[PDB]
Design an enzyme around this catalytic site. Structure first.
Site, PDB file in Angstrom:
ATOM      1  N   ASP A  67       0.840  -1.197   0.000  1.00 29.38           N
ATOM      2  CA  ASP A  67       0.000   0.000   0.000  1.00 29.38           C
ATOM      3  C   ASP A  67       0.878   1.252   0.000  1.00 29.38           C
ATOM      4  O   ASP A  67       1.367   1.677   1.052  1.00 29.38           O
ATOM      5  CB  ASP A  67      -0.908  -0.032   1.244  1.00 29.38           C
ATOM      6  CG  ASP A  67      -1.740   1.238   1.429  1.00 29.38           C
ATOM      7  OD1 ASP A  67      -2.081   1.916   0.437  1.00 29.38           O
ATOM      8  OD2 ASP A  67      -2.068   1.548   2.593  1.00 29.38           O
ATOM      9  N   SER A  70      -0.053   4.280   2.536  1.00 30.61           N
ATOM     10  CA  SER A  70       0.375   4.345   3.949  1.00 30.61           C
ATOM     11  C   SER A  70       1.877   4.085   4.105  1.00 30.61           C
ATOM     12  O   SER A  70       2.547   3.649   3.163  1.00 30.61           O
ATOM     13  CB  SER A  70      -0.435   3.364   4.814  1.00 30.61           C
ATOM     14  OG  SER A  70       0.060   2.032   4.749  1.00 30.61           O
ATOM     15  N   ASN A  72       3.234   2.544   7.270  1.00 32.05           N
ATOM     16  CA  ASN A  72       3.455   1.636   8.394  1.00 32.05           C
ATOM     17  C   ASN A  72       3.360   0.173   7.970  1.00 32.05           C
ATOM     18  O   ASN A  72       2.650  -0.164   7.019  1.00 32.05           O
ATOM     19  CB  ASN A  72       2.433   1.920   9.488  1.00 32.05           C
ATOM     20  CG  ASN A  72       2.682   3.239  10.176  1.00 32.05           C
ATOM     21  OD1 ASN A  72       2.039   4.234   9.873  1.00 32.05           O
ATOM     22  ND2 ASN A  72       3.636   3.258  11.100  1.00 32.05           N
ATOM     23  N   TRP A  74       2.111  -3.359   9.575  1.00 32.31           N
ATOM     24  CA  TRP A  74       1.410  -3.976  10.698  1.00 32.31           C
ATOM     25  C   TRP A  74       0.892  -5.358  10.361  1.00 32.31           C
ATOM     26  O   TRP A  74       0.635  -5.674   9.204  1.00 32.31           O
ATOM     27  CB  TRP A  74       0.288  -3.077  11.247  1.00 32.31           C
ATOM     28  CG  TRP A  74      -0.852  -2.740  10.314  1.00 32.31           C
ATOM     29  CD1 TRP A  74      -1.002  -1.590   9.598  1.00 32.31           C
ATOM     30  CD2 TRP A  74      -2.022  -3.527  10.051  1.00 32.31           C
ATOM     31  NE1 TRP A  74      -2.177  -1.618   8.887  1.00 32.31           N
ATOM     32  CE2 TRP A  74      -2.823  -2.797   9.145  1.00 32.31           C
ATOM     33  CE3 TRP A  74      -2.465  -4.789  10.478  1.00 32.31           C
ATOM     34  CZ2 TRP A  74      -4.047  -3.282   8.663  1.00 32.31           C
ATOM     35  CZ3 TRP A  74      -3.684  -5.272   9.998  1.00 32.31           C
ATOM     36  CH2 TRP A  74      -4.456  -4.520   9.099  1.00 32.31           C
ATOM     37  N   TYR A 112      -8.164   4.014   8.830  1.00 30.47           N
ATOM     38  CA  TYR A 112      -8.478   3.727   7.429  1.00 30.47           C
ATOM     39  C   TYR A 112      -9.983   3.995   7.216  1.00 30.47           C
ATOM     40  O   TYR A 112     -10.662   4.474   8.134  1.00 30.47           O
ATOM     41  CB  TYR A 112      -8.044   2.298   7.052  1.00 30.47           C
ATOM     42  CG  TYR A 112      -8.802   1.225   7.784  1.00 30.47           C
ATOM     43  CD1 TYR A 112      -8.433   0.835   9.067  1.00 30.47           C
ATOM     44  CD2 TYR A 112      -9.904   0.609   7.198  1.00 30.47           C
ATOM     45  CE1 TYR A 112      -9.143  -0.144   9.748  1.00 30.47           C
ATOM     46  CE2 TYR A 112     -10.621  -0.367   7.869  1.00 30.47           C
ATOM     47  CZ  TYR A 112     -10.241  -0.742   9.144  1.00 30.47           C
ATOM     48  OH  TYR A 112     -10.955  -1.715   9.808  1.00 30.47           O
ATOM     49  N   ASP A 252      -2.037   5.029  -5.911  1.00 27.95           N
ATOM     50  CA  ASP A 252      -2.184   4.227  -4.691  1.00 27.95           C
ATOM     51  C   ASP A 252      -2.349   2.748  -5.025  1.00 27.95           C
ATOM     52  O   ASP A 252      -3.368   2.343  -5.561  1.00 27.95           O
ATOM     53  CB  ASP A 252      -3.392   4.729  -3.883  1.00 27.95           C
ATOM     54  CG  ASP A 252      -3.427   4.193  -2.452  1.00 27.95           C
ATOM     55  OD1 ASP A 252      -2.974   3.056  -2.199  1.00 27.95           O
ATOM     56  OD2 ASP A 252      -3.933   4.919  -1.568  1.00 27.95           O
ATOM     57  N   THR A 255      -5.721   0.649  -2.848  1.00 28.32           N
ATOM     58  CA  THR A 255      -7.087   0.534  -3.397  1.00 28.32           C
ATOM     59  C   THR A 255      -7.015   0.157  -4.878  1.00 28.32           C
ATOM     60  O   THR A 255      -6.094   0.583  -5.571  1.00 28.32           O
ATOM     61  CB  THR A 255      -7.930   1.824  -3.164  1.00 28.32           C
ATOM     62  OG1 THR A 255      -9.197   1.709  -3.827  1.00 28.32           O
ATOM     63  CG2 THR A 255      -7.215   3.093  -3.646  1.00 28.32           C
TER      64      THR A 255
END
Ligand code: NAG
Length: 364
Positions: A67, A70, A72, A74, A112, A252, A255
């Site tokens: 992605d 973003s 990060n 996780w 989000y 992006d 999505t």
């Protein structure tokens, strides 16, 4: 195959709900919301591609979304409690099995579209595309039901800028750049034709010459801390309708559907010859698909055209891969060229020069 990560196709959360007979109005209303510090451009409802990474010694495998929206990393934790049933269907990071684990414990919240992911930070070794970095990432202890109760991916690898990262965590790609192992300080993203089996590829350090034709052309980043470029025209068929004065547009990988402002997109759907609307989304009778005109986007003084087959998804139970999305100022009205755009146009994200390159994608 040094810095390459094979992306694999998965049913999206929309596609899982569609296959279980859920109504298109119910899916958008309950699983596809956009709630009012870093900007949110996705709810992972339509994401169809994941790569695999390893975390720890020995490495524990996770399926993650690449992605660029973003910054990060996780994954779900074994510390995730019994109140969050979504954790019970995914791979879980267990610090107890890693000799390279080093605790941190500071809390984080990643926002989000459909909700928020909470947890604590932890350090460990992370293997992505055969490259080993010492990474701080989020151990998620509160994973909401929407959409992770039906998601077929464990977590998210952020490929954005360090300014977009929560708790000022140095992202994965930034650590790869510090090591000076890559030929170029770039990564490129290929999605093959929308098939049942065929997947894709993220290449770190360059571009795969097998997956494009002709040459790359580059557009400078217009907003320092994100993959954001100036768009100077959106066109249905021969007519240029929006963005003559200049629109901001984010590229992006998170999505899959292209986004624009609801008013600007409704204007496009009128000129497209499309009546039927379900919340953000727009459905069309599969008989009238071949008669749809081409959509085009004007980027860095060149046109990038999507034909009827490029922006429509036929699923057994036809939905257009465009949707309404209003980000307020100061961030401003933004478009989002999602994975639908990138499937047509092989995209290179360039961190040294702060620019984005596009080229006509192909197979081998
Ligand atoms: C936890 O990680 C942050 C980076 O987000 C770092 O600045 C901080 O020093 C770390 N804290 C501990 C206690 O290790």
């Amino acid at each position: 195959s040094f810095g390459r990560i094979l992306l694999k196709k998965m049913p999206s959360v929309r596609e899982i709900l569609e296959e279980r007979g859920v109504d298109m109005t119910r899916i958008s209303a309950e699983w596809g919301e956009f709630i009012k510090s870093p900007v949110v451009l996705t709810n992972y409802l339509d994401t169809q591609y994941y790569g695999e990474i390893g975390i720890g010694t020995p490495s524990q495998t996770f399926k993650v979304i690449f992605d660029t929206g973003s910054a990060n990393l996780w994954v779900p934790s074994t510390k995730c409690g019994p109140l969050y049933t979504a954790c019970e269907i995914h791979n879980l990071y267990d610090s107890s099995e890693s000799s390279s684990y080093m605790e941190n414990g500071t809390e984080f919240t990643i926002h989000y579209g459909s909700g928020k992911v909470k947890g604590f930070l932890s350090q460990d070794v992370v293997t992505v595309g055969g490259i080993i970095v010492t990474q701080t990432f989020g151990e998620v202890t509160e994973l909401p039901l929407i959409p992770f109760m039906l998601a077929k991916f464990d977590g998210v690898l952020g490929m954005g800028f360090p300014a977009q990262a929560v708790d000022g965590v140095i992202p994965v790609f930034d650590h790869i750049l510090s090591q000076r192992v890559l030929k170029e300080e770039v990564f490129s993203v290929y999605y093959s034709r929308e098939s049942h089996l065929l997947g894709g590829e993220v290449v770190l350090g360059g571009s795969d010459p097998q997956h494009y034709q002709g040459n790359f052309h580059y557009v400078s980043i217009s907003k320092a801390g994100s993959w954001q470029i100036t768009m100077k025209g959106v066109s249905v068929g021969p007519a240029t309708l929006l963005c003559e004065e200049g629109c901001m547009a984010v590229v992006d990988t998170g999505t899959s559907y292209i986004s624009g402002p609801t008013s600007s997109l409704q204007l496009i759907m009128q000129a497209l010859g499309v009546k039927e609307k379900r919340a953000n989304n727009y459905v069309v009778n599969c008989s009238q698909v071949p008669t749809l005109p081409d959509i085009s986007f004007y980027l860095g003084g060149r046109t990038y055209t999507l034909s009827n087959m490029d922006y429509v998804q036929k699923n057994p139970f036809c939905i257009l891969a465009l949707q309404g999305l209003d980000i307020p100022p100061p961030t401003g009205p933004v478009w989002v060229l999602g994975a639908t755009f990138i499937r047509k146009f092989y995209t290179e994200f360039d961190r040294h020069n702060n620019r984005i390159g596009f080229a006509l994608a192909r197979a081998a």
